[PDB]
Design a protein around this ligand. Structure first.
Ligand SMILES: Cc1cn([C@H]2C[C@H](O)[C@@H](COP(=O)(O)OP(=O)(O)OP(=O)(O)O)O2)c(=O)[nH]c1=O
Ligand SMILES: [Ca+2]
Ligand SMILES: [Ca+2]
Ligand SMILES: [Ca+2]
Ligand SMILES: [Ca+2]
Ligand SMILES: [Ca+2]
Ligand SMILES: [Ca+2]
Ligand code: NA
Ligand code: NA
Ligand code: NA
Ligand code: NA
Ligand code: NA
Ligand code: NA
Length: 899
DNA sequence: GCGGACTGCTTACC
């Protein structure tokens, strides 16, 4: 097989690399890499190297990496540019692996681990590491085994061995319900003291050294705690055995927080993977909370506080440690962020941990792309931060909208890049710009007949291929493939959801199919014969396939969009606001241009004139009021809801899209662009159910609307799905129960009507005080707590949630055992009625947790339900209903005087 | 006593 790297590090004049050889074995080699950098030279000096602008350069080979660094500094002192890859690790990887890396994941040691630390005095600071590590579970992906290190003897208690029999038993059975599919993969090891556990762990680590190291919060807790604990006990030299190169780096942040860097290891903390790649914003990021959200597994329920869990129930203590490690594996099997990371990493030829940085990722990609043409990359330069203009957003008239069709452009900014051919080395020149609306209205003089143009004034060559458009097209093509798989899985999902209305009573088995492809007629035929058993399991498998596809497409989308954004970041080698602005300005033109073209087409094809059909639009989308389109054919001529949905689908697909294609084709001509790539396709088909009192949709303002959707990008929903953007139902700061209640109000408004809404509202208002306090608590990040802390009391302009935290601190003040609110993390927030014993109007505590028993009963007693209902529920509901022009409560009328 | 304008903070949409 082709060789491929695992990890790479620069240590002085040496590149330390771990790699899988052509025989499949893991090796490690120390290479004294001789890097090359470049300097401009006279034209007369023949060469094969040129910078991206065509200027010749001479290659400077250095005896070592240190000599190359010094040269860079002297070239700075002289005042001349030093070209080439200054991150020598990237240069090494590029040289060593001059080919598309095909890797074998089964050969990469992926380690998932989690540790337990009993601490009687609050959170055990990893920097201090004063308390014993009394449990470690370490999953090795090559062995496919859970290595469990259990401390039986500790200054905090002596305990019996953990029982795997009991662990496997149902909770109802007194057991721990450690998933049966892993019981056989557990390798259990008890220890009579910590030193022996730790030393044993280090020896295990040496035989099975992680390449990818992950887990939940491993970077901020597990790793630094293990490192410092071992360092405190055995000394630093022993601690450094955690690095296959015996080199670590302690980077410190004073508030004492430490982040350790283990050379030769790529740490991908899963919480960081999840935050960057999941596209969620969660009220809490405890593994308990995320596991529930992702896998629908129950919360690991134990009696008593964690600080006393080991002493009282060591059996469950260890089982929960094992389960916590497995839950991250389960989440990854679903989301597949480790696969994504490996993929990206080997594509760009970077350290795997650098997938968190789109700039490093693209710098490496572009660099490799340019290296192949014997071209030389420019030196990084210093730039001041500058604001610059972005997308256009249409101000919508607040109102209801019965029938709505939406259209969106495909990969807008990356497409704009490819079309215009925007790249650092494809810049041709500039032109005198007319006001933006002159280009939008097609009044302005054609910018150029020789070059490709943006309305920001930039001109680019139409013949020369750009390195940026070239490499952004490659990833875009990947993105497009996976989206195909995603949508197919989605369409298959719906097919199964409908079939679940004819559950055929029988004992059957789930059909063998690749959900990434639209079910064949044969398969669709079979499906209509299965029962809830086989159907529900195919639905699950279809949804897992869809999610896997989502991860792959949405993060390649993120990557390419991040290349756009990078052009607007001063730390990007190819930073250039000429290009970044060329993209955004072109975008503003494109959108408002098609707004006009679409309006023109519809006023004509409908017959009317001067009517505004586009009611809203954001960046690259338009929402077309389709009332007049439906009215033409009249509602009578429709058999059911699905009928007119078919109608609009066909209408948009047959008439509107070709018209839009024509509109953009002309625009591309106007700007003399390299290639027409403005592909606007239909998005949503929304409207109330046929013959109902539902309003279909509504807008309250920019980025705040709801739509009752029947079709989305070709997927016809078995049941109508609510598309809600911006509204309180979508925000993580909104209490769970309020989100749910607000959503039902919206569903009722859009699907059923005013009467139904008032019915539900009256009900919710009556019963809402029985809601669990957590479900009705607000959520918020807690930044700069100390900034507003004046003697434990709110300083000037102290934010509401911060006030709540202070209230909390005072309430628990003194109790070293009470849960502490962490700077930067999130908190639940509740209002307290006047006269409460807390001495303030609100209180806050760490999100995703029950508030400490110390004060729980008092908080429950003094909750201000009235303020809760009015601030979090009624006010937003008032905004929804006012805009749509409805009332959530029956108004008083002249009829109120009749019996 | 408190509404309207401005600010900080937070969390959306693209
Ligand atoms: C979502 C998102 C969009 N944008 C910009 C660039 C996008 O092209 C533009 C529109 O975003 P989107 O229309 O939401 O997504 P997309 O057009 O890039 O690709 P697709 O529609 O097929 O899913 O807004 C960002 O810069 N960053 C982002 O995270
Ligand atoms: Ca011993
Ligand atoms: Ca788009
Ligand atoms: Ca059936
Ligand atoms: Ca054209
Ligand atoms: Ca099309
Ligand atoms: Ca689309
Ligand atoms: Na833990
Ligand atoms: Na159970
Ligand atoms: Na120490
Ligand atoms: Na049937
Ligand atoms: Na006309
Ligand atoms: Na969009």
């Amino acid at each position: 097989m082709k060789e491929f790297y695992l990890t790479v590090e620069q240590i002085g004049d040496s590149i330390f690399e771990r790699y899988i050889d052509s025989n499949g074995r893991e090796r490690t080699r120390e290479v004294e890499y001789k890097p090359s950098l470049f300097a401009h030279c006279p034209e007369s000096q023949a060469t094969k190297y040129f910078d991206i602008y065509g200027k010749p350069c001479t290659r400077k080979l250095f005896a070592n990496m240190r000599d190359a660094s010094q040269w860079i500094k002297r070239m700075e002192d002289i005042g001349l540019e030093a070209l080439g890859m200054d991150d020598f690790k990237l240069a090494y990887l590029s040289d060593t692996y001059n080919y598309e890396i095909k890797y074998d994941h089964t050969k990469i040691r992926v380690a998932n681990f989690d540790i337990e630390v009993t601490s009687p005095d609050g959170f055990p600071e990893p920097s201090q590491a004063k308390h014993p590590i009394d449990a470690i579970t370490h999953y090795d992906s090559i062995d496919d085994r859970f290595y469990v290190f259990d401390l039986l003897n500790s200054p905090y208690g002596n305990v019996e061995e953990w029982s795997i029999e009991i662990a496997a038993k149902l909770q109802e059975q007194g057991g721990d319900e450690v998933p049966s599919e892993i019981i056989d993969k557990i390798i259990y090891m008890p220890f009579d003291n910590e030193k022996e556990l730790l030393m044993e762990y280090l020896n295990f680590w040496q035989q099975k050294t992680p390449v990818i190291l992950t887990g939940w919060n491993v970077e901020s807790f597990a790793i630094p705690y293990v490192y410092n604990r071992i360092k405190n006990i055995f000394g630093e030299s022993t601690a450094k055995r955690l690095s296959p190169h015996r080199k670590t780096r302690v980077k410190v942040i004073e508030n004492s927080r430490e982040i350790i860097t283990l050379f030769g290891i790529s740490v991908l903390d899963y919480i960081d993977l999840y935050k960057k790649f999941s596209f969620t914003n969660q009220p809490s990021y405890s593994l308990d909370y995320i596991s529930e959200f992702e896998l629908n597994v129950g919360k690991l329920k134990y009696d008593g506080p964690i600080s006393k869990l080991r002493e009282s129930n060591h059996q469950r203590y260890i089982s929960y440690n094992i389960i916590a490690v497995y839950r991250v594996l389960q989440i990854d099997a679903k989301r597949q962020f480790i696969n994504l990371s490996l993929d990206m990493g080997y594509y760009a030829k970077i350290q795997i941990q650098s997938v968190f940085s789109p700039i490093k990722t693209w710098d490496a990609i572009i660099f490799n792309s340019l290296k192949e043409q014997n071209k030389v990359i420019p030196q990084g330069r210093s730039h001041p931060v500058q604001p610059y203009p972005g997308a256009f957003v249409k101000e919508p008239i607040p109102n209801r909208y019965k029938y709505v069709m939406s259209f969106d452009l495909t990969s807008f900014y990356p497409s704009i890049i490819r079309q215009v051919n925007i790249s650092p080395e494809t810049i041709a020149g500039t032109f005198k710009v007319a006001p933006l609306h002159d280009y939008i209205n097609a009044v302005a003089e054609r910018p150029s007949d020789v070059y490709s143009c943006s309305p920001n004034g930039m001109m680019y060559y139409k013949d020369r291929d750009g390195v940026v458009p070239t490499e952004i097209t490659k990833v875009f093509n990947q993105r497009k493939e996976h989206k195909g798989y995603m949508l197919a899985a989605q369409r298959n999902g719906e097919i199964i959801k409908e079939a679940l209305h004819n559950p055929n009573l029988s004992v059957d088995e789930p059909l063998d199919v690749d959900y990434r492809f639209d079910f064949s007629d044969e398969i669709k035929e079979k499906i209509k014969k299965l029962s809830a058993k086989s159907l529900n399991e195919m639905l699950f498998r279809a949804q897992r396939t869809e999610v896997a596809g989502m991860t792959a497409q949405i993060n390649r989308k993120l990557l390419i969009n991040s290349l756009y954004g990078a052009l607007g970041n001063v730390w990007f080698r190819y930073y250039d606001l000429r290009n970044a602005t060329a993209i955004t300005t072109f975008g503003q033109m494109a959108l408002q241009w098609i707004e006009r073209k679409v309006n023109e087409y519809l006023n004509e094809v409908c017959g009317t004139e001067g009517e505004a059909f586009v009611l809203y639009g954001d960046t690259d989308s338009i929402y077309v009021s389709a009332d007049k389109i439906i009215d033409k054919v009249g509602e009578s001529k429709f058999r059911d809801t699905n009928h007119w949905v078919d109608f609009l689908d066909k209408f948009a697909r047959e008439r509107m899209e070709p018209a839009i294609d024509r509109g953009f084709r002309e625009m591309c001509e106007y700007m003399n662009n390299k290639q027409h790539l403005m592909f606007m396709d239909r998005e949503a088909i929304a409207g109330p159910p046929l013959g109902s009192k539902g309003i279909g949709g509504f807008w309250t303002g920019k980025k705040r609307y709801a739509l009752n959707v029947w079709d989305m990008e070709g997927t016809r929903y078995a049941e109508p799905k609510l598309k809600i953007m911006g509204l309180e139902t979508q925000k993580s700061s909104t209490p769970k129960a309020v989100q749910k209640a607000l959503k039902e109000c919206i569903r009722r408004m859009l699907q059923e009507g005013e009467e139904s809404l008032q019915e539900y509202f009256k009900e919710f208002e009556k019963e809402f005080r029985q809601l669990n306090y957590i479900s009705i608590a607000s959520v918020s990040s807690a930044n700069n707590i100390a900034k507003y802390d004046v003697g434990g009391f709110p300083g000037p302009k102290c934010p509401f949630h911060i006030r709540g935290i202070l209230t909390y601190n005072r309430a628990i003040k003194g109790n070293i055992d009470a849960p502490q609110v962490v700077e930067g993390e999130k908190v639940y927030v509740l209002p307290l009625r006047e006269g409460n014993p807390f001495g303030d109007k609100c209180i806050a505590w760490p999100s995703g947790t029950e508030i400490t028993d110390l004060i729980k009963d008092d908080v429950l007693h003094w909750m201000d339900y009235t303020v809760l209902l009015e601030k979090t529920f009624i006010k937003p509901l008032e905004g929804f209903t006012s805009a749509a022009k409805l009332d959530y409560e029956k108004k008083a009328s002249l009829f109120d005087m009749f019996d």
